[PDB]
Design a protein around this ligand. Structure first.
Ligand SMILES: C/C=C(/C)C(=O)O[C@H]1C(C)=C2[C@H]([C@@H]1OC(=O)CCCCCCC)[C@@](C)(OC(C)=O)C[C@H](OC(=O)CCC)[C@@]1(O)[C@H]2OC(=O)[C@@]1(C)O
Ligand SMILES: Nc1ncnc2c1ncn2[C@@H]1O[C@H](COP(=O)(O)OP(=O)(O)CP(=O)(O)O)[C@@H](O)[C@H]1O
Ligand SMILES: [K+]
Ligand SMILES: [Mg+2]
Length: 994
């Protein structure tokens, strides 16, 4: 039953045809189970090991790697019978890289939480029902509860389904339903229908929601909806159905592997076409097995050279270390890759209470009526010092302190505040700080009354624990609180009914004290209190009352205002029905205005500045709050979002205003808007999607289970540290200090991280560019493998990997936050910079093979056909005559390979330095800015020297230490890469566009 809140007790009973005193019949339970199913959220979306390791291998680069291991593995079964048992080292290493990969992908799963699952925490195991088999109640599995069931609940129970309350057995019934929203004050529940069929949940005063807790009471009810059709159920489905896009980096990396795969193919075709003369070779002889070996051993060298195998491990290290840096600055990032999307944030929607403000309220101004005389009006305005909940502070009239007792309106205004109050105080001794007992806005009142000793109580010597509620107690001794009328949003007020507690204080009989939103209660006033006396309410006084309330609320004071009033002649107790808020507004009429109180919920110290950072950074900030639109605009002005005298007819909106727009004007409103007041939780998701439709990158704050779908929908979901468990698991980020300024600090760090990450990505990819040219020449010129795949593996995982990591620690730019947000559709390498890495990879591929060629041809340690005929080395074991009067196994020598490899390793340290900056010279930007990177270069060189010298390792790498004269050539060959980039950099700034 969808609309159970809008129906009568009887109607719901009749809908399912069940009797409240008997329950459902076994047959009716059979039938209701097959119609509505069991009372549970769907089982989790199943994944497994066999399905998890395959996911690791449905990447494309890793697929190609896997194939490259196979060929290598067959190759390690045909090279020679005994040339090298290190034939087997190649394929077994590639597998490790895949396995290591596979392993990590799954210990990142055995740890990751699910928000759909975090909901289940709010499903209770058991429930209680009455049914027709038994007179008495039976405890059963909440799983087996059905719509139409008669259910019982009491203190401490978790609510099993969504239930229409039938009868409240106890004298009252309060419910904790903060699991939905966040605010923990329990709320009164009633039995009568709620007329509006499109009522929001806060107004469903007669419903109990699955997942909430009973704070006080015992109630019988009938089950309206179960499982996925509850309110927490309707959120599970919004959360399941919402699909998160990939981060723009994953998006780019995916596009990389897609193009890399087609490139490799072009190169194979090319290699084949250049060796199409091989078809003109004679048929008898040669060695097909040695041709096929060669076009295969070059085929795998082509794969491990193309792919930046170290890259995912480097990205993940930067993120993980950035993450821990960010936790130092109060931001707890949940998934590593969202650090990239965070820094891209173009729009921020933050809640106001608690995040833009301290949620620590106290009363600042207050006024009573001093005199009424026709049109002539005089208010009596006051100010109050002290910003905390502590009773330290004083009242002033035009800046001189006053003794509040000599104002009679003041003693009355005091007692309303103390009596019309469900909250209080208790002094904490471990912190030495006064904290609040209930609601913050009421606690401000209970604090205000402690500052105006209306009865001038000698309190100048009291113990602090007993100083907590001293002035309030004397006002509790005066009137017994017979009962109270709870706050509801139709009438936006609350009240209490009181009787005097003595026999000498027992004057004037019974009274109602009233507080609420000023429009509503002032419209219900026909009298005005001037001191002890009383006078009929008029125009001139109502003017000069709403006048001051508009000033206090829409002024640079930005104050939250309550009107306070008494009903001097309340109805007789027997003529009030207390079980039905429908009548509570009518009970609270014919009032006497006593005064108005104005409190502040202050901005946080750091918020002012973070918003200017956002302007500097091209980030739109959007406030979301509960204040009336008028004071909402005013707080925006005070925190910098708006200018003081800047027109905002079209950049603020209430929910009521937002809905009354056709869907067209709604999308457009979200492009301009910077303020939303009094929203319905559904409006957060709408706002996101509209923002998304402009390719915005949106950060959204949220607190409770009913904020989860918008949290999961925004590009960056932001939860509060003090928020629910569920909202934390639905968010990409958690604020340990609930503070907005933390968000802005996270955007800053996430921009500083990507600009570093930007460079080591560029760095590693370029090396792979260079490697592939080395390989291509090898195959196109007809050269003995200048670089074996096993070596390349070392270079990409270890030798290159260390500078790349140091590069995540580049000093941040001074102007990180003075630039607009980065377009996600921005390529890493493009236009001119593409032409530049095309030239540098061009270099490297030539220098590497030329180091092998040099050692073969023009060098001292090996004769080699200067006539270039070395080329035909595969036909040396037979064609000794044809300009080859020398040896043959020399073309598998380690020495010319280490020449190549050393030239590669040395070249890559140089390129890491050129990579400290995209376009700035090293004469403008020294290498010793990144000290951690100077340091790591020294490390890899050692490891080069390690695998060149330590007896087990050179045979493994087909390597061989080279002497002083061979290092000098290695430097000669490699050192010029610095000079090459310094020139292309010179072009970038001085002659193209920039
Ligand atoms: C990595 C290994 C190299 C060999 C390669 O294939 O990369 C190409 C390709 C993948 C693109 C290119 C490379 O294109 C070439 O170098 C032309 C082919 C040369 C023929 C070889 C025989 C002489 C990148 C590498 O070239 C430069 C010059 O660096 C830059 C960039 O890559 C990036 O943006 C990296 C993504 C973070 C991409 O153009 C990229 O594809 C596009 O989708 C981008 C946007 O990705
Ligand atoms: N304890 C109380 N007794 C009577 N009226 C109260 C009250 N607390 C708040 N109000 C009044 O109720 C009006 C409606 O505000 P509501 O109380 O529903 O929201 P809220 O202040 O908790 C919103 P938010 O989501 O921003 O924190 C306010 O304008 C205020 O004048
Ligand atoms: K999200
Ligand atoms: Mg409130």
């Amino acid at each position: 039953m969808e609309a159970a809140h809008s129906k009568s007790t009887e109607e719901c009973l009749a809908y399912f045809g069940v009797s409240e005193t008997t329950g459902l019949t076994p047959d009716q339970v059979k039938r209701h189970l097959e119609k509505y199913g069991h009372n549970e959220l769907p089982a989790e979306e199943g994944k497994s090991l066999w399905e998890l390791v395959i996911e690791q291998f449905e990447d494309l680069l890793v697929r190609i790697l896997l194939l490259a291991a196979c060929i290598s593995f067959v190759l390690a079964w045909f090279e020679e019978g005994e040339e090298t048992i290190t034939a087997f080292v190649e394929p077994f290493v590639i597998l490790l890289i895949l396995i290591a990969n596979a392993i990590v992908g799954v210990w990142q799963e055995r740890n990751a939480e699910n928000a759909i699952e975090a909901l289940k925490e709010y499903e209770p195991e058991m429930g209680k029902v009455y049914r027709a088999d038994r007179k008495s109640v039976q405890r059963i599995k909440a799983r087996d509860i059905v719509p139409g069931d008669i259910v019982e609940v009491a203190v401490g129970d978790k609510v099993p389904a969504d239930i229409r309350i039938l009868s409240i057995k106890s004298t009252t019934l309060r419910v904790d339903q903060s699991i939905l929203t966040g605010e923990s004050v329990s709320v009164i529940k009633h039995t009568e229908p709620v007329p509006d069929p499109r009522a929001v949940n806060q107004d469903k005063k007669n419903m109990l929601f699955s997942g909430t807790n009973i704070a006080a009471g015992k109630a019988l009810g009938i089950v309206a909806t179960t499982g996925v059709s509850t309110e927490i159920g309707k959120i599970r489905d919004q959360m399941a159905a919402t699909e998160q896009d990939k981060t723009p980096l994953q998006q780019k990396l995916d596009e990389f592997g897609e193009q890399l795969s087609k490139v490799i193919s072009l190169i194979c075709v090319a290699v084949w076409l250049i060796n199409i003369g091989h078809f003109n070779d004679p048929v008898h002889g040669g060695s097909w097995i040695r041709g096929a070996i060669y076009y295969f051993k070059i085929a795998v060298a082509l794969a491990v050279a193309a792919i930046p195998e170290g890259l995912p491990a480097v990205i993940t290290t930067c993120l993980a270390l950035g993450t821990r840096r960010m936790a130092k600055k109060n931001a707890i990032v949940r998934s590593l890759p969202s650090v990239e999307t965070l820094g891209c944030t173009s729009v921020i929607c933050s809640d106001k209470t608690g995040t833009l403000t301290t949620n620590q309220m106290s009363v600042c101004k207050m006024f009573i009526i001093d005199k009424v005389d026709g049109d002539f009006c005089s208010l009596n305005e006051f100010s109050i010092t002290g910003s905390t909940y502590a009773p330290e502070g004083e009242v002033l009239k035009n800046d001189k302190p006053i003794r509040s007792g000599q104002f009679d309106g003041l003693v009355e205004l005091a007692t309303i505040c103390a009596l019309c109050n469900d909250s209080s105080l208790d002094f904490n001794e471990t912190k030495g700080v006064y904290e609040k007992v209930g609601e913050a806005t009421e606690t401000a009142l209970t604090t205000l009354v402690e500052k105006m000793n209306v009865f001038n109580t000698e309190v100048r010597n009291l113990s602090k624990v007993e100083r907590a509620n001293a002035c309030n107690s004397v006002i509790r001794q005066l009137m017994k609180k017979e009962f109270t009328l709870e706050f509801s949003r139709d009438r936006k007020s609350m009240s209490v009914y009181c009787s005097p507690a003595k026999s000498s204080r027992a004057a004037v009989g019974n009274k109602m004290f009233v507080k609420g939103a000023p429009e509503g209660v002032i419209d219900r006033c026909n009298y005005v209190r001037v001191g002890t006396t009383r006078v009929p309410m008029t125009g001139p006084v109502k003017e000069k009352i709403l006048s001051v309330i508009k000033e206090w609320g829409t002024g640079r004071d930005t104050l939250r205002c309550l009107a306070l009033a008494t009903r001097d002649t309340p109805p007789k107790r027997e003529e009030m029905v207390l079980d039905d808020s429908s009548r509570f507004m009518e009970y609270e009429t014919d009032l006497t205005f006593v005064g108005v109180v104005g409190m502040l919920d202050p901005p946080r110290k750091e918020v002012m500045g973070s918003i200017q950072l956002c302007r500097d950074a091209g980030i739109r900030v959007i406030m979301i709050t509960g204040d009336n639109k008028g004071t909402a605009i005013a707080i925006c002005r005070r925190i910098g979002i708006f200018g003081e005298n800047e027109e905002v007819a079209d950049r603020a909106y209430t929910g009521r205003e937002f809905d009354d727009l056709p869907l067209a004007e709604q999308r457009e409103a979200c492009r301009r808007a910077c303020c939303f007041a009094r929203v319905e939780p559904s409006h957060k998701s709408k706002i996101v999607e509209y923002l998304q439709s402009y390719d915005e990158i949106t950060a959204m704050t949220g607190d409770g289970v009913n904020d989860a779908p918008a949290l999961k929908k925004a590009e960056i979901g932001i939860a509060m540290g003090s928020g629910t468990a569920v909202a934390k698991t639905a968010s990409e980020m958690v604020l340990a200090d609930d503070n907005f300024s933390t968000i802005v600090a996270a955007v800053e760090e996430g921009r500083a991280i990507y600009n570093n990450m930007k460079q080591f990505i560029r760095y590693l990819i370029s090396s792979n560019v260079g490697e592939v040219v080395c390989i291509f020449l090898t195959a196109a010129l007809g050269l003995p493998e200048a670089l074996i795949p096993v070596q390349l593996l070392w270079v990409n995982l270890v030798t290159d990997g260390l500078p790349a990591t140091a590069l995540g620690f580049n000093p941040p730019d001074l102007d990180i936050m003075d630039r607009p947000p980065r377009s996600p559709k921005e390529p890493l390498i493009s236009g001119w910079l593409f032409f530049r890495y095309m030239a540098i990879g061009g270099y490297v591929g030539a220098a590497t093979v030329g180091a092998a060629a040099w050692w073969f041809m023009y060098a001292e340690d090996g004769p080699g056909v200067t006539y270039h005929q070395l080329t035909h080395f595969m036909q040396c074991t037979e064609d000794h005559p044809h300009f080859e009067g020398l040896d043959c196994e020399i073309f598998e020598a380690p020495e010319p390979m280490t020449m190549a490899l050393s030239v590669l390793v040395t070249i890559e340290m140089c390129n890491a330095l050129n990579s400290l900056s995209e376009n700035q010279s090293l004469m403008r930007m020294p290498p010793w800015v990144n000290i951690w990177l100077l340091g790591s270069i020294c490390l890899s060189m050692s490891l080069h020297f390690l695998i060149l010298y330590v007896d087990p390792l050179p045979m493994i790498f087909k390597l061989k230490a080279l002497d002083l004269t061979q290092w000098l050539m290695v430097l000669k060959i490699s050192l010029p890469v610095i000079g090459l980039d310094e020139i292309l950099k010179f072009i970038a700034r001085n002659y193209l566009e920039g």
